[PDB]
């Protein structure tokens, strides 16, 4: 009965990574429109974009790690 | 350009039509009670 609980807990906790895709789509879209206005400043824009992408993916990875821990 | 056909084939068509009607009627009569008997036995 414990194995069933572990399986369903893993199957429920894995959902939390859904939000990472939406955040990634949002940040990349902003970079596209932002570059259109000031192509000169394309050097500084990226640093911001990378930061956001990394932060969102880190949150998703944290949720995935929690799911892996509950599985094992 | 309509063309008259050989009457020999012309009679042979209608003869087979009548015979087919006869066979269909007889086979339906034969198979009507058997189907009901099989369905009742399946119950």
């Amino acid at each position: 009965i414990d194995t069933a609980a572990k399986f369903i807990g893993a199957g429920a906790a894995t959902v939390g990574v859904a939000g990472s895709g939406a955040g990634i789509g949002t940040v990349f879209g902003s970079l596209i429109i932002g570059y259109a206005r000031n192509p000169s400043l394309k050097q500084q824009l990226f640093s911001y974009a990378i930061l956001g992408f990394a932060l969102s993916e880190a949150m998703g990875l944290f949720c995935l790690m929690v799911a892996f821990l509950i599985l094992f | 350009p309509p063309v008259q056909v050989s009457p020999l084939i012309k009679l042979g068509r209608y003869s087979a039509l009548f015979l087919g009607v006869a066979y269909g009627a007889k086979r339906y009569n034969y198979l009507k009670p058997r189907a009901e008997e099989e369905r009742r036995i399946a119950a």
Binding site: - | V5, I9, R13, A16, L19, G20
Partner: protein, 81 residues
């Protein structure tokens, strides 16, 4: 309506003369002609038969025979209702 005028009226005039000439029960006067044709069949059946004839003629005969075969199938549907 107009398509009916352009087809069904030709069905009753053009198609009618196309078919009614060739699709109608035969006169009894042609029965001896058909019997003579049966004699024609018998003469080859005893000897000669193919007599090294063309394949095309045999294909014509077979195709007409298959057309004749179809009507017996139609009769079963008629009786089935």
């Amino acid at each position: 309506v107009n398509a009916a005028v352009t087809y069904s009226k030709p069905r009753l005039a053009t198609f009618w003369h196309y078919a009614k000439v060739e699709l109608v029960p035969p006169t009894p006067a042609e029965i001896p002609t058909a019997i003579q044709s049966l004699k024609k069949i018998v003469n080859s059946a005893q000897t000669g038969s193919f007599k090294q004839l063309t394949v095309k003629e045999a294909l014509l005969n077979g195709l007409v025979a298959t057309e004749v075969l179809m009507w017996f199938y139609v009769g079963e549907i008629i009786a089935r209702a």
